[PDB]
């Protein structure tokens, strides 16, 4: 299929109308960020030659 970018949302714009929220949601989201890698050391002489 051709992938849908998203749902269409025509904002009801006019020159004298505003939308004011009457309520709120306290939303908690996760963000995972890598920090470090495994500290690996390779003996070049022992790797190549044993």
């Amino acid at each position: 299929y051709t992938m849908s970018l998203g749902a269409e949302n025509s904002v009801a714009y006019s020159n004298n109308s505003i939308a004011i929220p009457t309520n709120f949601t306290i939303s908690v989201t996760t963000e995972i960020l890598p920090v470090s890698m495994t500290k690996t050391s390779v003996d070049c002489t022992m790797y190549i030659c044993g």
């Binding site: 749902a7 020159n15 505003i18």
Partner: protein, 170 residues
């Protein structure tokens, strides 16, 4: 297509697998980059058919209905100004879908300000939105309202100068 060459190449091990894996990682990283830049909204916002924004003109940045590529005149000028086992993989997002994403972002920031980036898109008149932006930089709303025709004219002139500067600089 030489079989003897590939038989000798197998003596070197999995170098070719490493190079193909690195190139595949680069190829998927480009699509991830395009997703991270352009696909920040899950709603495809559209401008109203009547372009009454209190004197503010966005025709040079809104998509042109007469063009089949559905690009803005600025974006059309930008696309005109950019010109043995090898393959070129096409990007996951084509240019018209990237233009549709930018059009959705433009419609959201014109009709709703910064509200669509923090939740539901809340409509607001564009001069009032500009006044809010004026208060963000520490200038009172009255200054914006009193000099609204001048601000709209300066904005339209600057957008036209942007198009002229892009069309006149190689």
């Amino acid at each position: 297509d030489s079989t003897e060459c590939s038989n000798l190449l197998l003596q070197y091990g999995s170098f070719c697998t490493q190079l193909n894996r690195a190139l595949t990682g680069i190829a998927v990283e480009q699509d991830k980059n395009t997703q991270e830049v352009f696909a920040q909204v899950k709603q495809i916002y559209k401008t109203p058919p009547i372009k009454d924004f209190g004197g503010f003109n966005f025709s040079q940045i809104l998509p042109d209905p007469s063009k089949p590529s559905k690009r803005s005149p600025i974006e059309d000028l930008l696309f005109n100004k950019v010109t043995n086992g090898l393959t070129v993989l096409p990007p996951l997002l084509t240019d018209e879908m990237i233009a549709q994403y930018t059009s959705a972002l433009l419609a959201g920031t014109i009709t709703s300000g910064w509200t669509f980036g923090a939740g539901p898109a809340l409509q607001i008149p564009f001069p009032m939105q500009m006044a809010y932006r004026f208060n963000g930089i520490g200038v009172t709303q009255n200054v914006l309202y009193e000099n609204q025709k001048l601000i709209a004219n300066q904005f339209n002139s600057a957008i036209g100068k942007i198009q002229d500067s892009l069309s006149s600089t190689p």
